[PDB]
From a paper:
Among them the berberine bridge enzyme (BBE)2-like proteins (pfam 08031) can be set apart due to their unusual bicovalent attachment of the FAD cofactor. Here, we show that the enzymes catalyze the oxidation of aromatic allylic alcohols, such as coumaryl, sinapyl, and coniferyl alcohol, to the corresponding aldehydes and that AtBBE-like 15 adopts the same fold as vanillyl alcohol oxidase for berberine bridge enzyme and other FAD-dependent oxidoreductases. Furthermore, mass spectrometric analysis has shown that AtBBE-like 15 is located in the cell wall and thus might participate in as yet undefined reactions relevant for the formation of the cell wall. Thus, we suggest that AtBBE-like 13 and AtBBE-like 15 participate in the adaptation of the extracellular monolignol pool prior to polymerization and are thus involved in cell wall formation required during certain growth phases and in response to stressors.
Protein crystals were obtained using sitting drop conditions yielding diffraction data to 2.1 Å. AtBBE-like 15 adopts the same fold as other BBE-like enzymes, i.e. the VAO-fold that is characterized by a FAD-binding and a substrate-binding domain (shown in green and orange, respectively). The FAD cofactor is bicovalently linked to the peptide chain via a covalent bond of His-115 to the 8α-methyl group and of Cys-179 to the C6-position of the isoalloxazine ring. In the case of AtBBE-like 15, the gatekeeper residue is a leucine (Leu-182), and thus oxygen reactivity is suppressed because the side chain blocks access to the oxygen pocket. Tyr-117 and Gln-438 are engaged in a hydrogen bond on the si-side of the isoalloxazine ring (2.6 Å). Therefore, these residues were defined as substrate coordination motif. The hydroxyl groups of Tyr-117, Tyr-479, and Tyr-193 point toward the active site with distances to the N5 locus of 4.8, 4.6, and 5.0 Å, respectively. The ϵ-amino group of Lys-436 is located 3.1 Å above the plane of the aromatic ring of Tyr-193 and engages in a cation-π interaction. This arrangement of Tyr-479, Tyr-193, and Lys-436 presumably favors deprotonation of the phenolic hydroxyl group of Tyr-193 and activates this residue as a putative active site base, and thus these residues were defined as a catalytic base motif. The docking result suggests that the orientation of the allylic alcohol toward the proposed catalytic base Tyr-193 is possible, although the aromatic ring is located in the hydrophobic pocket, and thus this orientation is consistent with the productive catalysis found for AtBBE-like 15 with this ligand.
Numbering used by the authors: 27 to 42, 45 to 300, 305 to 532
Write the structure that this text describes.
């Protein structure tokens, strides 16, 4: 009479299928269970043996199975963690702290995507990757797209609920700025659409972050116009090529460029056996290369972009280009729904309100050259992002935001070098405090960082709540208290039911 036998009995006692082959446990098959656990889990840091493991994993095949799983987990007082794409930076979708026992409900079998051009919209289920959504859209039309993530393997279920920015945010805003409806499962196992859940809950799931406001089954997204021809480029500058001053110029102008123009910077050490710092300016321009060169000559001639560097292509090709696909790959590669690689990593995030001066940058370089594999990605805001209020949706990082920084340290060897890398990024984060947003020091919720504080820990939730959501946190808490009073949907940094 095991926990899983009770779980299955509760499942089948629901009037809505075999299910055995949708279960994974150490007792069934330890080898299979491990592989299912690791399958979509992206951060290898959270797959080491030291990490708490779920008693079992359940992969529902229909929406009714998701309902039954909620009902049964609640009835057996079994802690639930939801997983769609598995990209959580802190492994929150497959690793739970001090909630023994816990179960993973993995939604990777619900990947239906239905595109309807006539209404300029689409329904995408939680287990679909954004790459799959992108592919299905372009399949119907070369002049439609969607402004969500840059990474192809991001799961819908955990992506859009955090806001979902990408290379088209300066023109169309966030993925969460472009949704119409959704279907969610509440704490009582009811399926609610926007009409049933009400406007407050629908607001909450447009930036509130995953794991807090019920199980998202599907989003109804609003398609956006993209041109038949999109231009991209990647221009690389090192410190020996006036790199620091060039980056400083980028800080001053990137958020002020034409709405069609998105130029992010990818920054990492590079071999010159010494190292230098290398900045890759990667761009997507919703227009032709002729117009682009004119835009660049006026506002960023320091980059030294030439026609030779520009490549014109379809929107879907540009998506794969930015995502770092080889030119040898085809759009159908997006259908595999697999990440390009995996490693152990620790990430943090920042928002910049005033340009980091060159001396601040040089101090950053000194630290980067002290680390094995540091990497930082800077993403320009402005454009449409400045024209939306901070309280429109829970995502608060709008006007005044020059750009968002993603801090990264990665490694291949797990617990061998983990401690060193963790300490390095925390030191660097502390160094940067003087240069980034203050009161609060803003952070992106889909870049989970437990260092900011947890519900259970001694850090008050208002402190880290203010970083992710700013002035929207209090309202999120109120909604959470009303929607899930028993705190069934919860994790280390879930929106609490109350404050105090
Ligand atoms: C790995 C990775 C992440 C990226 C990348 N680039 C991004 C970008 O260009 N724009 C972005 O906006 N975000 C980017 N991120 C971060 C991702 O957005 C986040 O990592 C998302 O949370 C990923 O979602 P998903 O892939 O589904 O990860 P999961 O671990 O499955 O879930 C995350 C989080 O949400 C909860 N949750 C999952 N599924 C559901 C459902 N159906 N309903 C409610 N809540 C859900 C989980 O509990 C978990 O806490 C680029 C790369 C390479
Ligand atoms: C338990 O599950 C594991 C994992 O799928 C199974 O082991 C694999 O079996 C397949 C089929 O021959 C092989 O291709 C793999 O090489 C095996 N795994 C590895 C990597 O060794 C196994 O079949 C299952 N055992 C039972 C009892 O059915
Ligand atoms: C937007 O931010 C800029 C830069 O800080 C500021 O000057 C301006 O007042 C802000 N605009 C609005 C509408 O508040
Ligand atoms: Na706390």
């Amino acid at each position: 009479s095991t926990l899983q036998q009770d779980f299955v009995k509760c499942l089948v006692d629901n009037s809505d299928f075999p299910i055995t082959a949708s279960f994974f446990s150490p007792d069934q098959n330890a080898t299979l269970f491990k592989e299912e656990l690791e399958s979509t889990a992206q951060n290898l840091r959270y797959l080491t043996p030291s990490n708490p493991k779920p008693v079992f994993i359940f992969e529902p095949l229909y929406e009714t199975h998701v309902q039954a799983a909620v009902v049964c987990a609640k009835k057996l007082q079994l802690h639930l963690r939801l997983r769609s794409g598995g990209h959580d930076y802190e492994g929150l979708s497959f690793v739970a702290e001090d909630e023994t026992p816990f179960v993973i409900v993995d939604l990777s079998k619900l990947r239906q995507v239905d595109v309807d051009l006539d209404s300029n919209s689409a329904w995408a289920h939680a287990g679909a990757t954004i790459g799959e959504v992108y592919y299905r859209i372009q399949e119907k039309s070369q002049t439609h797209g969607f402004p969500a993530g840059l990474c192809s393997s991001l799961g819908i279920g955990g992506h859009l609920v955090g806001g979902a920015y990408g290379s088209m945010m300066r023109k169309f805003g966030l993925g969460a700025d472009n949704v119409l409806d959704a279907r969610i499962v509440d704490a009582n196992g009811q399926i609610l659409d926007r009409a049933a859940m009400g406007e407050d809950v629908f607001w909450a799931i447009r930036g509130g972050g995953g794991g807090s406001f019920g199980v998202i089954l599907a989003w109804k997204i609003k398609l956006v116009p993209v041109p038949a021809t999109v231009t991209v480029f990647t221009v690389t500058k090192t410190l020996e090529q006036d790199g620091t001053k060039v980056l400083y110029k980028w800080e001053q102008i990137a958020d002020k460029l034409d709405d069609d123009l998105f130029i992010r910077v990818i920054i990492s050490p590079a071999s010159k056996g010494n190292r230098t710092i290398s900045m890759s300016y990667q761009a997507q321009f919703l227009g032709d290369s002729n117009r682009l060169l004119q835009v660049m000559q006026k506002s960023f001639p320091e980059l030294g972009l030439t026609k030779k560097d520009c490549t014109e292509m379809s929107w879907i090709k540009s998506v794969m280009y930015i995502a770092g696909f080889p030119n040898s790959a085809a759009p159908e590669a997006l259908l595999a729904g697999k990440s390009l690689f995996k490693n152990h990593f620790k990430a943090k995030s920042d928002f910049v309100k005033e340009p980091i001066p060159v001396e601040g940058l040089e101090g950053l370089w000194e630290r980067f050259l002290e680390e094995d594999s540091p990497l930082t990605i800077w993403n320009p805001y402005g454009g449409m992002m400045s024209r939306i209020s901070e309280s429109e949706i829970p995502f608060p990082h709008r006007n005044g935001t020059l750009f968002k920084i993603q801090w990264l340290s990665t490694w291949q060897d797990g617990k061998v070098s983990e401690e060193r890398h963790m300490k390095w990024i925390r030191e660097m984060y502390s160094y940067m405090e003087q240069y980034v947003s203050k009161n609060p020091r803003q952070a992106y919720v889909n870049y989970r960082d437990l260092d900011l504080g947890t519900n259970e820990g001694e850090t008050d939730a208002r402190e880290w709540g203010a970083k992710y959501y700013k002035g929207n946190f209090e309202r999120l808490v109120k909604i959470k208290g009303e929607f899930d009073p028993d705190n069934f949907f919860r994790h280390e940094q879930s929106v609490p039911t109350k404050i105090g």
